[PDB]
């Protein structure tokens, strides 16, 4: 039993809700919140911009130190950093950005990072400003993640399409 509330069960381990991931993180304080990161950990907009804003820019400060030490992530890769006031940890995961020409096949590699964590609160990777079809992203999530994932979909209209169209 965990604290996540109001989710629709899609499979044994994948759950979905129409919700704002920032507000959901502040309410649940999960062990892991996933950020929709880029390789530079520049959290300017989309999910990343919103999560960073909610930390009063502390996520960005920590991220800049991480990059100065380690260099950029790989597309499809991840790193674990602090969750600040939102969660114990933030798993920064880089899905391919279609608006940069990046191979959509890397979306599966990106979701594989979730399997290193027993339970996570997450967005659909490569959705929103990353330009991928959220229906495809959901299919990859369900077919790749084996740990317990609680997916937050900000847009009410998109959520209904994902549910109503889920196979
Ligand atoms: C851009 C942005 C800023 N802050 C955010 N917080 C959470 N999500 C998103 C985002 O891009 N969402 C996508 C996917 C989803 O509905 O989850 C979406 C799809 C259709 C219509 C609107 C938005 C953002």
UniProtKB/Swiss-Prot annotation:
Protein name: Papain-like protease nsp3
Biological function: Responsible for the cleavages located at the N-terminus of the replicase polyprotein. Participates together with nsp4 in the assembly of virally-induced cytoplasmic double-membrane vesicles necessary for viral replication. Antagonizes innate immune induction of type I interferon by blocking the phosphorylation, dimerization and subsequent nuclear translocation of host IRF3. Also prevents host NF-kappa-B signaling. In addition, PL-PRO possesses a deubiquitinating/deISGylating activity and processes both 'Lys-48'- and 'Lys-63'-linked polyubiquitin chains from cellular substrates.
Residues of the Macro domain: 1-167
Membrane topology, as annotated: Multi-pass membrane protein
Annotated localization: Host endoplasmic reticulum membrane
Phenotype when changing residue 164 to L: In strain: Gamma/P.1
Assembly information from the UniProt record: May form homohexamers. Interacts with N protein.
Catalytic activities: Thiol-dependent hydrolysis of ester, thioester, amide, peptide and isopeptide bonds formed by the C-terminal Gly of ubiquitin (a 76-residue protein attached to proteins as an intracellular targeting signal)
Region of the whole protein represented: 1025 to 1191 of 7096
Activity modulation comment: Inhibited in vitro by GRL-0617.
Source organism of this protein record: Severe acute respiratory syndrome coronavirus 2
């Amino acid at each position: 039993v965990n604290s996540f509330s109001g989710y629709l069960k899609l499979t044994d381990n994948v759950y979905i809700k129409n919700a704002d991931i920032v507000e959901e993180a502040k309410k649940v304080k999960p062990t892991v919140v996933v950020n929709a990161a880029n390789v530079y950990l520049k959290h300017g907009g989309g999910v990343a911009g919103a999560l960073n804003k909610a930390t009063n820019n502390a996520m960005q400060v920590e991220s800049d130190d991480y990059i100065a030490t380690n260099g950029p992530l790989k597309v499809g890769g991840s790193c674990v950093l602090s969750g600040h006031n939102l969660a114990k940890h933030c798993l920064h995961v880089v899905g391919p950005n279609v608006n940069k020409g990046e191979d959509i096949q890397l979306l599966k590699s990106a979701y594989e990072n979730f399997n290193q964590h027993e339970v996570l609160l997450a967005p659909l990777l490569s959705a929103g400003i990353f330009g991928a079809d959220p229906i495809h992203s959901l299919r990859v999530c369900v077919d790749t993640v084996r740990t317990n994932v609680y997916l937050a979909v900000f847009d009410k209209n998109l959520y209904d399409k994902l549910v109503s169209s889920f196979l």
